[PDB]
Symmetry: D2
Subunit: 267 residues, 4 copies
């Protein structure tokens, strides 16, 4: 008697057990969903992480920059879930921006090749995934992507913030296409979560950037009327599952904020 | 086994069986919630409507313009749900603007007495209800109000649109207060519901379409916010409008 | 040649020489505008303040809560500027919220009578002024009101923030009406300025706690603003209002221009 | 006694006399500004402007053009002189990403070229020119409101969403020099590509789509909207280049007849 009982859902973006996608996958399985997972590059290592999930799930290779991976995705998912079965949900939890465009490097010093790679992986791929998977989605279906509120500029995030602005626009266009299939498309704008890259910047991977991210995180918990725990991805995973469910059936091309309400408060 | 199993929820705003609050109340009961209902003025007529709901629920009088009704509300709800029990949810589905400020009357011809009454009932009362009920709410609780996107001006809705702009601001302040109790506060901005060119353009803009004769998708959205499935969302607006507000043409 | 050469502009909201309206009036006169000023209640005291402006201007009584003052306004302005002459600009620089709705008093403790008075003066009156003055405005005309960004909640401002949310909505409806006359309607959302009430809260009038939270708000504003923010200087705000009163933003209406050092565009 | 008397302003984006940049350049010269123009033929068009102005080559995708830009501008305005204004009126999206081609059928090479020219180049131009800008300076870019999706504009709308974000970051950098950075979000203007789509170049369906958008725009705008007249847009850019909006940065000013503030 789970929120997602009998739903077939594809979850991309698991790299470590701290990944937001790991928590999305875990909560979805606790709620009765049958998953199909996608991983990038380090598949053997990712399989060791996904073995820690409460239930078994097939793991498929997917590099969103690889046109052949995208062209074969629907076929490979259909083989994993059985012929005549379609997906009810798709989770895009993919993002990347090279250090030249996200970190200590000045905003003006990011070369376009790095910015373009970042936008391809972080924004364009939301449309690529929808193009590949909409033909194998059921009506009442739901596509969810991960966002970080880019309405205002902030230190260090730089070109990743620009990529999120592009993602929000892409989501609105994806909703127009998804609507033809009776499928919704939405983003979850999360507050800061201590994943691999976030733990590295706070850890000093130098001093100036580390301090900026610390100040940003402290301010977030301060502004949030219900507080914000950057070490806990569960409220974010629950929000994604709410959008994957049948309980937000008239919401599409939109953004749901799972940020403790921090974006609604100035001070 | 439902979405709101064992939750105690107060639902205001039922006047007819077409009221958005009637559909919110119906879906919440289908999902296992134990309700307390509030009504305005025509209580005998409202009790006949609430008798049509799938389960029994106590009906309490509440005129949001009446300070005595507000002062006694928590006490009356506690008596209805039993001593030692608190609310998990509150639904504000109240709105009114006299014809002088909402309809065919020119925007400039609405007298302030009418605008003030409309704002009192439609916006200020969201704070009044939260003030009265937060002392009797459990942590993890949820306050939901009804909204109509007022970010852009439109024909006829005139001063009611102004009242919705005020409501959205009130909601952000209510969230600051509610947070102290571990309670969330959010609005559901719905598309038009039958409770003409403006309403036709909605279904055309909406990527998943819009059915103005069906309040169920709106009621389901309210129930999602009343549940434990949006635990990090507060002082916010969820749009149950078929996605029309995200599309220009 | 001034930015507003030969323009006839009504400016409301002067109470002290620190009032944003005083600085709007001063810059407009420096730029060649012919003004008509409106004041509330203490008119003799306001006349002593307006005598400090670079040029003479008739001062008319206007209580926005007084229906008779609104009904006679157009007639009184016409008498001041001469028959056959119309206004090119209108500046609404009026705001009020009692201490029960704006200050140290809890958000839930503001009674509706106080909130209603505050909304009447701060939001509804923008429509009242437009209704009274649009029949005596020239095409190409401009109505400007003062705003404080209410998109997010903040400490102390409380019901004044709610009144500003209502004002922004009113402005969008006023633009629909003004458009029929070839007149624009816009708001200038300013950063914090040390006017009468602002000087009082910073000074400790509302206590230690309120003084500290307004100080923190002001420091954060100058920090966030990429070009900084000087709360002691109303001139950048006055210049922005004059830009909207000019012919240089001719396709902007029902809108908000931010004169806040760019603070609202930055998170940290 | 013009709005921009004695100001030295760089204007990019002139291709035809219908280009928004042509009208920005014309109004700025009428208002006393001394211009430096950049083009990507164009000299024959710029000869139609009221005053003479040096024309410099600038392909924003060309790293050598960007690296030498400040030096070439300094040579044109004289040593010891700096710019007071910069106008970015550059945009491009191949037909695969903007037009009749389905949103999902745009290849990344085309989208990436479009984003490079339309969004990233706003940061490139600021990087190259901020070292040669005076305090009180102003950088202005052209935008088309991308807050909501719309037919045909597709990936160009995505590029504009990216541009709005870029502008907010450019403002942080510009602030260090006492320089403002803002965008003007204009309503539809009948420039080269816009005249082609309305004319039927992309077919019957696309032509009808853009005609409906234009009609709706004029209808919603409380003061109306004339798509054949770029002058209100050029005036707005000049207002931002002036000293009259000195506390506005990382922002968007809408020169759209107020259409974006009205639903119907
Ligand atoms: N961590 C936060 O603070 C935070 C906040 C808000 C939103 N988000 C977003 O949440 C999403 C997940 O990030 P995370 O924080 O869980 O971090 P993460 O590092 O654990 O996850 C990012 C994932 O993207 C994958 N990826 C990168 N390049 C790829 C490619 N070419 N093909 C396919 N997948 C590729 C990586 O393998 C990884 O699994 C991202 O979109 C991120 O922007 C994160
Ligand atoms: N109908 C739509 O198209 C639409 C769209 C979006 C949002 N909404 C909002 O949803 C809410 C419910 O409206 P509805 O469409 O269900 O219509 P409705 O007429 O059925 O409900 C409005 C309710 O407000 C109550 N009310 C009025 N004055 C009151 C007072 N003094 N004290 C207490 N309650 C009072 C009425 O008794 C009634 O039950 C309102 O806030 C409305 O603005 C409606
Ligand atoms: N000071 C700031 O930090 C700040 C920031 C942003 C916007 N604003 C806005 O700027 C405007 C001017 O405020 P200010 O800061 O110059 O303060 P102020 O105290 O100098 O001016 C407010 C004016 O409102 C007038 N007023 C009040 N009740 C009135 C009534 N019934 N009829 C007519 N006039 C009436 C007062 O007489 C006074 O002249 C207001 O709308 C305010 O909300 C101020
Ligand atoms: N309806 C509209 O026309 C409209 C609406 C809003 C905003 N805008 C924006 O206004 C700006 C000007 O466009 P326009 O409508 O005048 O069209 P246009 O065709 O007249 O101008 C576009 C310019 O971009 C230049 N450009 C393209 N690739 C370049 C490169 N690699 N390096 C340098 N320059 C390059 C072209 O040479 C041309 O000068 C654009 O940013 C556009 O997106 C246009
Ligand atoms: C003798 N007269 C007064 O004591 C008086 C005048 N105008 C007032 N409210 C106006 C001021 C101008 N304005 C502003 C001012 C600042 C931001 C936005 N709007 C509109 C509201 C006013 N309000 C009550 C009050 C009484 C005493 C105060 F110290 C404040 O300051 C304050 C509170 C909260 C946030 C910022 C500042 C406010 C009192
Ligand atoms: C010989 N050169 C070309 O054929 C050419 C020039 N610039 C172009 N794109 C520019 C146009 C101006 N601009 C705009 C225009 C309108 C809104 C936003 N940006 C930036 C992008 C361009 N794009 C492909 C295209 C090719 C043919 C067209 F009719 C269009 O028009 C169109 C498409 C979709 C929406 C509105 C209009 C576009 C082609």
């Amino acid at each position: 008697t789970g929120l997602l009982d009998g739903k077939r859902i594809l979850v991309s973006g698991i790299i470590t057990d701290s990944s937001i996608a790991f928590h999305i996958a875990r909560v979805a399985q606790e709620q009765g969903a049958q998953l199909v997972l996608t991983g990038f590059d380090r598949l053997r290592l990712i399989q060791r992480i996904t073995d820690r999930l409460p239930a078994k799930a097939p793991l498929l290779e997917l590099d969103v920059q690889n046109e052949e991976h995208l062209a074969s995705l629907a076929g490979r998912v259909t083989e994993a879930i059985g012929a005549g079965n379609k997906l009810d949900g798709v989770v895009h939890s993919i993002g990347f921006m090279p250090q030249t465009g996200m970190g200590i490097n000045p905003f003006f010093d990011a070369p376009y090749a790095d910015v373009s790679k970042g936008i391809h992986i972080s924004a364009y791929s939301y449309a690529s995934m929808a193009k590949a998977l909409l033909p194998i989605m059921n009506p009442g279906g739901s596509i969810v992507g991960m966002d970080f509120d880019p309405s205002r500029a902030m230190p260090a995030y730089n070109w990743m913030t620009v990529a999120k602005s592009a993602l929000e626009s892409v989501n609105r266009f994806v909703a127009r296409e998804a609507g033809k299939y009776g499928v919704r498309s939405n983003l979850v704008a999360a507050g800061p979560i201590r994943t691999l890259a976030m733990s590295a910047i706070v850890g000093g991977a130098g001093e100036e950037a580390g301090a900026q991210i610390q100040l940003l995180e402290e301010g977030w918990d301060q502004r949030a009327p219900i507080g914000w725990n950057m070490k806990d991805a569960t409220p974010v995973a629950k929000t994604v599952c709410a959008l994957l469910s049948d309980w937000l059936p008239a919401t599409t091309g939109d953004i749901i904020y799972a940020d403790g309400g921090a974006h609604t408060q100035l001070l």
